[PDB]
Amino acid sequence: KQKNRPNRLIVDEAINEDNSVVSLSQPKMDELQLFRGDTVLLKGKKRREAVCIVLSDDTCSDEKIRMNRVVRNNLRVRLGDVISIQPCPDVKYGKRIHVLPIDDTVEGITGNLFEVYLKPYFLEAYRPIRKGDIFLVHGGMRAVEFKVVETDPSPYCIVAPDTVIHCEGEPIKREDEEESLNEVGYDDIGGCRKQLAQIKEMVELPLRHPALFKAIGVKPPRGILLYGPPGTGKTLIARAVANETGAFFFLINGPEIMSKLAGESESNLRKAFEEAEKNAPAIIFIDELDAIAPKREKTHGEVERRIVSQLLTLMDGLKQRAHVIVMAATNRPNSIDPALRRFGRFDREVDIGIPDATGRLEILQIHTKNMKLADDVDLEQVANETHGHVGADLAALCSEAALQAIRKKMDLIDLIDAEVMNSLAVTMDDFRWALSQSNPSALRETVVEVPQVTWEDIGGLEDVKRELQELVQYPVEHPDKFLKFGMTPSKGVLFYGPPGCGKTLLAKAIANECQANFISIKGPELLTMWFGESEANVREIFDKARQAAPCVLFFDELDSIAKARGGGGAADRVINQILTEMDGMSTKKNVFIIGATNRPDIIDPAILRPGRLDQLIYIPLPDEKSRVAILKANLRKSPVAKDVDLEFLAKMTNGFSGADLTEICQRACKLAIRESIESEIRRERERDPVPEIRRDHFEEAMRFARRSVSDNDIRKYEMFAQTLQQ
Amino acid sequence: NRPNRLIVDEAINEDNSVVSLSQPKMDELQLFRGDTVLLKGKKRREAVCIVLSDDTCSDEKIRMNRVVRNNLRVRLGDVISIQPCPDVKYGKRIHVLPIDDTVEGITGNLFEVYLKPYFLEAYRPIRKGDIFLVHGGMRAVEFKVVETDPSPYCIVAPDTVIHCEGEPIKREDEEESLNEVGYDDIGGCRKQLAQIKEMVELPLRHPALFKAIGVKPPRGILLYGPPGTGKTLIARAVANETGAFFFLI
Ligand SMILES: Nc1ncnc2c1ncn2[C@@H]1O[C@H](COP(=O)(O)OP(=O)(O)O)[C@@H](O)[C@H]1O
Numbered sequence: 014k015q016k017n018r019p020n021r022l023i024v025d026e027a028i029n030e031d032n033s034v035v036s037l038s039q040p041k042m043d044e045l046q047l048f049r050g051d052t053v054l055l056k057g058k059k060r061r062e063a064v065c066i067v068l069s070d071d072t073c074s075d076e077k078i079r080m081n082r083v084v085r086n087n088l089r090v091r092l093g094d095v096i097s098i099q100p101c102p103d104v105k106y107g108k109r110i111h112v113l114p115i116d117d118t119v120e121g122i123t124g125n126l127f128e129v130y131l132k133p134y135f136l137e138a139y140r141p142i143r144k145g146d147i148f149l150v151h152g153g154m155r156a157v158e159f160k161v162v163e164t165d166p167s168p169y170c171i172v173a174p175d176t177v178i179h180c181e182g183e184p185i186k187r188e189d190e191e192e193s194l195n196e197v198g199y200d201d202i203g204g205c206r207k208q209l210a211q212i213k214e215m216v217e218l219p220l221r222h223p224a225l226f227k228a229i230g231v232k233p234p235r236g237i238l239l240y241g242p243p244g245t246g247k248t249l250i251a252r253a254v255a256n257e258t259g260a261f262f263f264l265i266n267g268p269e270i271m272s273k274l275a276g277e278s279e280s281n282l283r284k285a286f287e288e289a290e291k292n293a294p295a296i297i298f299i300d301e302l303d304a305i306a307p308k309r310e311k312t313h314g315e316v317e318r319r320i321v322s323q324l325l326t327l328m329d330g331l332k333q334r335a336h337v338i339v340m341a342a343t344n345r346p347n348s349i350d351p352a353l354r355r356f357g358r359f360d361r362e363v364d365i366g367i368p369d370a371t372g373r374l375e376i377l378q379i380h381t382k383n384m385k386l387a388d389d390v391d392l393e394q395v396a397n398e399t400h401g402h403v404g405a406d407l408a409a410l411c412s413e414a415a416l417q418a419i420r421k422k423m424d425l426i427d428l429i430d431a432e433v434m435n436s437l438a439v440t441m442d443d444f445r446w447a448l449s450q451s452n453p454s455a456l457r458e459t460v461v462e463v464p465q466v467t468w469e470d471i472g473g474l475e476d477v478k479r480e481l482q483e484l485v486q487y488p489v490e491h492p493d494k495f496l497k498f499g500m501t502p503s504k505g506v507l508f509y510g511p512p513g514c515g516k517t518l519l520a521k522a523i524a525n526e527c528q529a530n531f532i533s534i535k536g537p538e539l540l541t542m543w544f545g546e547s548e549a550n551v552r553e554i555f556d557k558a559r560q561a562a563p564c565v566l567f568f569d570e571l572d573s574i575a576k577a578r579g580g581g582g583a584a585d586r587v588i589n590q591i592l593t594e595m596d597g598m599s600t601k602k603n604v605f606i607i608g609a610t611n612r613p614d615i616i617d618p619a620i621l622r623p624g625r626l627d628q629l630i631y632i633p634l635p636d637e638k639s640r641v642a643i644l645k646a647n648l649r650k651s652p653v654a655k656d657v658d659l660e661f662l663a664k665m666t667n668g669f670s671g672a673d674l675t676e677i678c679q680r681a682c683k684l685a686i687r688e689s690i691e692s693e694i695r696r697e698r699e700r701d702p703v704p705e706i707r708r709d710h711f712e713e714a715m716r717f718a719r720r721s722v723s724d725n726d727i728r729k730y731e732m733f734a735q736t737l738q739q
Numbered sequence: 740n741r742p743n744r745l746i747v748d749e750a751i752n753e754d755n756s757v758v759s760l761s762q763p764k765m766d767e768l769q770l771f772r773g774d775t776v777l778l779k780g781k782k783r784r785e786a787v788c789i790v791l792s793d794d795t796c797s798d799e800k801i802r803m804n805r806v807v808r809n810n811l812r813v814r815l816g817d818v819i820s821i822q823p824c825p826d827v828k829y830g831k832r833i834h835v836l837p838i839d840d841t842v843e844g845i846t847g848n849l850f851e852v853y854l855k856p857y858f859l860e861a862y863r864p865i866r867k868g869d870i871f872l873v874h875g876g877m878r879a880v881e882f883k884v885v886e887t888d889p890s891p892y893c894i895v896a897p898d899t900v901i902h903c904e905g906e907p908i909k910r911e912d913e914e915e916s917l918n919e920v921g922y923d924d925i926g927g928c929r930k931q932l933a934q935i936k937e938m939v940e941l942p943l944r945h946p947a948l949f950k951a952i953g954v955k956p957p958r959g960i961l962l963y964g965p966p967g968t969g970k971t972l973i974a975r976a977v978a979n980e981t982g983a984f985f986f987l988i
Pocket residue numbers: 201202203204243244245246247248249300376403404405408
């Protein structure tokens with residue numbers, strides 16, 4: 014970025030008396046790509062926006078903006094605060110504009126307010142406004158404020174001379190100016206920025222750059238595939254990259270292509286492309302491509318493969334034909350025909366995936382920005398407790414929570430619009446009941462995320478942590494050292510020993526401090542792929558690994574598949590595929606393959622071959638610093654008080670595994686919950702928060718023994734450590 | 740629960756032309772005597788009858804018609820509402836067609852036999868399609884409104900004649916016009932029926948509440964279940980308690 018976010022400006026008094034005119038300086042408008050007659054989008058406090066025309070000023074300061082008292086009150090700011098300016102170069106003219114004056118400004122005057130106030134104020138003026146601007150109109154020896162109600166270009170527009178002005182009777186008053194309907198934009202798009210920036214580049218370079226693609230010679234984004242779960246803001250993304258760029262959108266959908274009969278399938282599909290040809294600033298988006306073009310064995314018909322044929326003969330031959338780009342949507346990239354997915358056209362494919370916790374948080378922030386809540390819910394625990402939900406399901410979650418809030422209160426008056434909005438309130442219980450009544454769709458899917466451990470759960474093995482940093486982090490940070498000597502780094506590592514979940518948190522910490530993606534490969538999913546006789550599922554997983562580069566590929570226990578066999582054997586139907594993936598693994602892109610086993614005697618010797626899975630790391634029994642780190646993780650995200658004896662467990666529970674010391678904490682927590690609720694039972698029988706688990710309950714939690722490790726297996730692990738002791 | 744909705748008096752007679760007067764309720768609201776007074780039952784049903792005819796009912800109760808008691812609600816001993824709506828325009832000789840009991844006895848002139856010697860200047864201002872039972876001897880003969888000369892609720896002029904070419908069709912068509920719509924009439928797994936009742940009833944009667952939320956969750960509802968469960972009657976029961984066009988395919 015730049016210093017101090019240089020669109021931030023200081024409000025100052027103006028010289029011009031115009032309401033819709035703000036003033037800047039000469040090198041500021043040159044740096045911010047601003048003209049002397051162009052329009053901007055001003056943003057300020059209390060999430061209030063403004064649309065204005067920047068004019069040149071000579072008395073204006075370098076880092077200040079001159080404006081009158083109207084925009085200062087419209088942005089709800091006083092003298093001395095900071096405001097921001099955003100350029101708005103894509104404004105369209107308005108069609109119908111509804112204006113209603115405030116009640117105190119029309120007391121004493123009667124008649125038509127259009128020909129006296131509205132007609133001279135907009136007589137070839139072209140003043141831009143937004144929804145909620147209160148602008149002062151002078152006339153009849155008075156000063157009457159007029160407020161924008163609703164425009165057909167609903168976010169922002171310029172008053173055309175053909176715009177019909179609506180000034181009907183019974184106006185609204187000064188209120189909380191609630192938002193209820195709008196048009197989408199880049200801020201409306203949620204958490205997709207790692208791919209939103211890429212597709213932003215691949216549509217911004219087609220914008221107003223004809224000679225740039227002549228400098229390339231060829232246009233690189235000929236066809237763009239956007240695949241993911243159904244409903245991941247797909248047409249929202251397509252509509253968002255159209256209006257702010259400035260083009261003709263003209264969406265068509267595959268069901269509407271099949272909606273016409275035989276012979277009419279060429280009608281309104283080719284004609285869409287001559288429509289795109291006659292309007293060179295345009296994009297093309299098609300929805301449900303699997304309904305048009307499935308796989309070749311799935312093409313069980315004649316008219317549908319005819320439609321596939323006109324799509325192919327229209328998609329191959331638009332090479333520099335009004336420089337239009339083409340977008341498409343599908344569930345998975347292999348669901349479409351692979352002959353469509355070749356090169357020359359339809360090559361710039363991109364994944365979207367599910368949102369993360371912060372992406373879900375900002376999606377819910379967008380969906381709850383327009384609706385006033387009870388302002389005591391944090392909205393972060395709501396977006397953090399959800400898991401595997403599409404953004405459409407978050408919108409449905411917000412709608413059902415509002416339905417819960419409406420159904421909680423009884424019936425009001427029937428139909429003013431000032432009773433069921435200012436009484437809107439949602440609780441933690443409202444969204445919690447809404448969380449139960451919310452069917453997800455992104456479940457049963459390989460999630461992609463950057464998790465958060467922040468390196469301090471890990472106890473001991475600091476040289477092992479340094480080796481894991483040098484294998485993964487430092488090729489990303491300093492690849493010039495590895496290109497200095499040309500050494501191919503060890504991209505594959507093995508974990509063996511007790512059944513620990515600390516290797517999972519190790520991989521999570523690698524993805525965290527690497528700031529890279531994570532993929533959790535499940536052992537039950539591996540046996541699903543084995544017993545389901547579908548060994549081709551590895552390929553799209555590794556394709557998602559390539560498209561989510563850099564990433565961490567945490568595989569579970571691979572010896573369980575060999576445990577299912579034991580007549581004997583070395584490799585299985587899933588095992589031999591990942592060796593071909595490792596041979597197909599490039600040394601670039603910083604995609605790491607990390608393995609997690611328990612018993613390495615029953616694994617493939619081809620895994621033990623060099624270049625496939627390179628080095629083996631033993632994870633030993635937990636140590637006392639790792640035991641107090643385990644107790645710190647037990648104290649992580651849990652309300653606890655003082656007088657805790659963290660050194661009490663490590664002196665005698667050294668023979669137990671780390672899950673036993675974890676289960677001590679959950680058992681003491683359930684004991685605390687049980688004693689608190691029987692204290693509630695005592696309170697009800699008789700008709701303080703007690704936030705600390707008292708350590709007698711901790712000692713009753715550590716009393717029972719469930720030692721899951723075996724000492725002979727520990728000697729077996731030490732025997733393989735001595736085998737690797739060279 | 741509304742002040743208009745009040746408990747109903749028992750049916751003294753089976754006449755559509757007689758409504759008893761409740762004088763404390765007449766002192767409560769502002770109802771004007773004369774031609775037309777609007778009344779509502781339940782499930783979005785509209786009807787009009789005259790007032791100040793009998794003066795038999797006591798305070799906070801009004802005696803109404805028999806046909807607005809058996810229809811326009813789910814049962815007797817329930818609420819009835821009133822509404823002032825006077826001096827509407829006039830119609831001409833509606834409800835010429837009987838449906839059920841013409842096949843026994845004689846046909847007659849079909850309105851000079853049982854309609855003319857029974858009415859007392861309340862010229863049946865009912866919904867076009869609603870019924871009313873009247874006969875001289877048996878007093879259980881219904882008819883159906885088929886002539887639609889007036890578009891709003893209008894009384895007709897007395898001693899008017901139109902074409903008498905109407906023929907009876909069926910008896911069960913009155914029962915099949917509802918086809919037994921009722922939440923008591925439906926069987927009901929009451930939990931799932933409660934959520935579907937909520938998620939259609941919040942669409943019901945409050946179209947502007949969708950502007951308050953801004954998001955509409957009902958855009959389509961699947962009905963999972965094994966066949967034989969009344970799935971084609973569950974949607975029929977959800978309809979016509981709301982009041983809309985059902986139109987199954
Ligand atoms: N990522 C998202 N962010 C915000 N809103 C979303 C998102 N995904 C879906 N929605 C909501 O879901 C509705 C339909 O979007 P979507 O299901 O993506 O359409 P399509 O499936 O045709 O791409 C929209 O009204 C939008 O508000």
